Structures are given as structure tokens and as C-alpha cells.
Amino acid sequence: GTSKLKYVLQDARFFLIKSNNHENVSLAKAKGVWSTLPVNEKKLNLAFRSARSVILIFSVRESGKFQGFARLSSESHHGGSPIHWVLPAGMSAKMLGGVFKIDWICRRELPFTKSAHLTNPWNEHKPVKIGRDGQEIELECGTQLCLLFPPDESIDLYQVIHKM
Ligand SMILES: CC1(C)CO[C@@H](c2ccccc2Cl)CN1
Numbered sequence: 001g002t003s004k005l006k007y008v009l010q011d012a013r014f015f016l017i018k019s020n021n022h023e024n025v026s027l028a029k030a031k032g033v034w035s036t037l038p039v040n041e042k043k044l045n046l047a048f049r050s051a052r053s054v055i056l057i058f059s060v061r062e063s064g065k066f067q068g069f070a071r072l073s074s075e076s077h078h079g080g081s082p083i084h085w086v087l088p089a090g091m092s093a094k095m096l097g098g099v100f101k102i103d104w105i106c107r108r109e110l111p112f113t114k115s116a117h118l119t120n121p122w123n124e125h126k127p128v129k130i131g132r133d134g135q136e137i138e139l140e141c142g143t144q145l146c147l148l149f150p151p152d153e154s155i156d157l158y159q160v161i162h163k164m
């Protein structure tokens with residue numbers, strides 16, 4: 001192992017990402033991309049310039065689990081290869097902001113039952129599973145949450161470390 005993982009997480013910032021469906025998380029895992037609404041896009045762009053690593057921790061609503069976590073490798077950008085997200089009814093892709101490139105650190109699941117001992121000081125000390133899309137997770141809570149995930153032996157953090 002966990003040493004390179006701990007190195008990547010050092011002095012990182014952490015954000016809870018809530019997806020309405022598994023299909024969008026699968027697309028993010030396959031393509032290394034994420035997009036969010038403009039209020040959260042602005043927060044994440046500020047964070048990306050502010051810290052050595054910005055970590056997104058993903059949870060599909062109603063799943064009772066986190067589906068993994070990833071590190072921002074860029075600020076948001078427009079005009080790239082379009083992403084065939086599952087948009088909610090009535091909503092358009094023009095309501096979205098840019099696309100963030102991300103490097104996955106763990107693609108494994110973690111059930112909320114395993115994180116019940118972790119509370120987030122930035123969300124009223126509620127269990128870390130609770131929070132709106134984009135909620136920041138304080139450093140110690142976010143580090144411990146990431147360390148609870150099963151190790152993802154398919155991932156080599158060597159190339160991630162070199163981007164910092
Ligand atoms: C360094 C810091 C992020 C500062 O804020 C601390 C805190 C947050 C919310 C309520 C109480 C306290 Cl002590 C946690 N560590």
C-alpha cells in the first residue's frame with residue numbers, strides 16, 4: 001503493498017461523486033473521463049490547481065456501495081471526443097461543462113457497511129457515505145476511506161506518481 005497508494009494520497013483533496021447509474025461509472029472506468037455540472041466543475045478545477053492530487057470517490061445512487069476512486073489528471077476541457085453518457089430525461093449534454101481526464105486508482109467496490117466508522121467533518125460529521133455530489137471529504141477521513149478498498153492489482157501507480 002500500500003506504500004505507493006499512500007504516497008499518491010498524501011496531502012490530496014477528496015470529493016464524493018454520486019452517479020445516478022452504473023452505466024456512467026462504467027464509461028468513466030473504460031474511457032478515463034468524468035463530467036459534472038458547472039457548480040462542481042468550478043470546484044474541481046480550483047482543487048486541481050490547489051493540491052498535488054485530487055481524488056474522486058464514486059458511488060452509484062441506491063447501490064449501497066462505492067465503485068472505486070480515481071485521480072484527476074487534468075482540468076476540465078471542451079471539444080474532445082464526445083462521451084455517450086446516460087443523461088437524465090429532459091436534460092442535454094450542453095448543460096454539462098467540460099471533460100476531466102482521470103486515472104483510476106481502484107476499480108473495486110466497497111460496501112457502505114465497511115465505512116460506517118468514518119465520518120466527514122465537512123458534512124456535519126455524517127457518515128462519509130452521506131453527501132451530495134461534489135461534497136469535499138476531509139483529508140483524514142478520505143485517506144482512511146481509500147485505504148479500506150480492496151487492493152486493485154491490475155493498476156500500477158508508477159505512472160500516476162510521475163504525473164504529480
Ligand atoms: C485541519 C482540519 C481540516 C481543520 O478542521 C478540523 C475540524 C473540522 C470540522 C470540525 C472540527 C474540526 Cl477540529 C479538521 N482538521
Ligand SMILES: CC1(C)CO[C@H](c2ccccc2Cl)CN1
Nearest residue numbers: 024035036085087091092095096
Ligand atoms: C456527466 C454525467 C455522468 C451524465 O450527465 C449528467 C447530467 C447531464 C446534463 C444535465 C444534468 C445531468 Cl445530472 C451528469 N453526469
